[PDB]
Amino acid sequence: NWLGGLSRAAFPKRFVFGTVTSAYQVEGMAASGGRGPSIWDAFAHTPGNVAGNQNGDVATDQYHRYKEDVNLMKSLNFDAYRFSISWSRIFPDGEGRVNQEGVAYYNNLINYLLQKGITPYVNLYHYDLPLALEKKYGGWLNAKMADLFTEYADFCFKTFGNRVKHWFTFNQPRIVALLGYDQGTNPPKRCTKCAAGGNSATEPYIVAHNFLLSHAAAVARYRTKYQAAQQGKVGIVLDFNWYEALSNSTEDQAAAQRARDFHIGWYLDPLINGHYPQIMQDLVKDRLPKFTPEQARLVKGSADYIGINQYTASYMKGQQLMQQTPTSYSADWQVTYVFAKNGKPIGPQANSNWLYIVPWGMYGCVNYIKQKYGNPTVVITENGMDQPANLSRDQYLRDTTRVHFYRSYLTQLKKAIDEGANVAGYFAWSLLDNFEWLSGYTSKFGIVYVDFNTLERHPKASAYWFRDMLKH
Numbered sequence: 001n002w003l004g005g006l007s008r009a010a011f012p013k014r015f016v017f018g019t020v021t022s023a024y025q026v027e028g029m030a031a032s033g034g035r036g037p038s039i040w041d042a043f044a045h046t047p048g049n050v051a052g053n054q055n056g057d058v059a060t061d062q063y064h065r066y067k068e069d070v071n072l073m074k075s076l077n078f079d080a081y082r083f084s085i086s087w088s089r090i091f092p093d094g095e096g097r098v099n100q101e102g103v104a105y106y107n108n109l110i111n112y113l114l115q116k117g118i119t120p121y122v123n124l125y126h127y128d129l130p131l132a133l134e135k136k137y138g139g140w141l142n143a144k145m146a147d148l149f150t151e152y153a154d155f156c157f158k159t160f161g162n163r164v165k166h167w168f169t170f171n172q173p174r175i176v177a178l179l180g181y182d183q184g185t186n187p188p189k190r191c192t193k194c195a196a197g198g199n200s201a202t203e204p205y206i207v208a209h210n211f212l213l214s215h216a217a218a219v220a221r222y223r224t225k226y227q228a229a230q231q232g233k234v235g236i237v238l239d240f241n242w243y244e245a246l247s248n249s250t251e252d253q254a255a256a257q258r259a260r261d262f263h264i265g266w267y268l269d270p271l272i273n274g275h276y277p278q279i280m281q282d283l284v285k286d287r288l289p290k291f292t293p294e295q296a297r298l299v300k301g302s303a304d305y306i307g308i309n310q311y312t313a314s315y316m317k318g319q320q321l322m323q324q325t326p327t328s329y330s331a332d333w334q335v336t337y338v339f340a341k342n343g344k345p346i347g348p349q350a351n352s353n354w355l356y357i358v359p360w361g362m363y364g365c366v367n368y369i370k371q372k373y374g375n376p377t378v379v380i381t382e383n384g385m386d387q388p389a390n391l392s393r394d395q396y397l398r399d400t401t402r403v404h405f406y407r408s409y410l411t412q413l414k415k416a417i418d419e420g421a422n423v424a425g426y427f428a429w430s431l432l433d434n435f436e437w438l439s440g441y442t443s444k445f446g447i448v449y450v451d452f453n454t455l456e457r458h459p460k461a462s463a464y465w466f467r468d469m470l471k472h
């Protein structure tokens, strides 16, 4: 049967199913309603940065249509909606004056969600640093971000926390550090060879450290000031793709484990254990910032749940570790990616080149977190796949590969949960086709099709799949 035996009965009691978007990717009204620019507005408005020179000025216009979209997610039997608050829509300069029209939008959205029985899961940050803070403070290179972020978080907790009980601070700090400061392909476009400046061997580590300190500071403020009255929770969202040793050799197993540690351990070791992974300490040495004991104790235990963004898997091949002149965070791992074993590809690719369809990667990742980190509460906060540009409406709607994707991945998640993994929810990326960063509108991740000429929504087969699977 097309559900492949899946339904709410196949998951734990009260398990949460939702869809996910982010502010810049769906809201539109980027320079309206009092919103100040983010680093992504500046980046996307620069010729050549995004496919087609596209930007999120209008995006899906969820700003005007949010009741349509909430009605749609309710009709598809979802329980929750993960979305983000645009920092520069609340504080156009990142600090100081509040944009009340921006506050009113999120109040209206939250209140409508609650009216329709959809639980809001709210991210405070999703790549969209206020441009004013990048320019004034140097963004995530500056430890002062902990204070600036905490003050923004405090405002959001005070303003929305009587209603919002499920928060996340950040989305994928690894990707900000990697793309923004190692490879230099996302804002602020910093890297060793980059026009904006930078250093791919040091800045990714500074940036990751400042995300951890800022998360920890925001959660401390929540706990000491808001939690008693509001009784909510705050987590963080981290990407984790699976790494599988190419062979059972000691060097290949070591390589796969090094990749896990540099990918997810970079954040989870501090959040669970109060220190960076030993391998990172050993290889990155002086380029890896050191937490003071007090900072370590602030960071450890600071996530009430861990959001995991899971898409894909790779094989890893290793050799003996060697002394090498530092060049980049990426090179520090001393691993070799391989996308075939025994002459067979690990999986077929979706539209995005990095996205190999490998459902057992979901089991791999969830099992590994369960076994390595004492089975923390995990929420799968992003999972999905994309179609390419230029298809007809009907071709978008007949998204049979995405239907297969969700059925297979959710089956593998169910396998991990049935084996005891403490997974509390699952969120499909994305409710809607949207602005896919450097791909612009050329990558379609939605379970609902969006016609980017007319802005019309049309649910795809995968939307009806969810509606059927999730019926109460």
Ligand SMILES: *[C@H]1O[C@H](CO)[C@@H](O)[C@H](O)[C@H]1F
Residues within 6 Å of the ligand: 022, 025, 171, 172, 309, 382, 429, 436, 437, 445
């Ligand atoms: C997770 O991945 C999707 C697909 O690349 C992005 O659109 C989201 O912003 C990111 F959070």
Ligand SMILES: [Zn+2]
Residues within 6 Å of the ligand: 061, 064
């Ligand atoms: Zn509009």
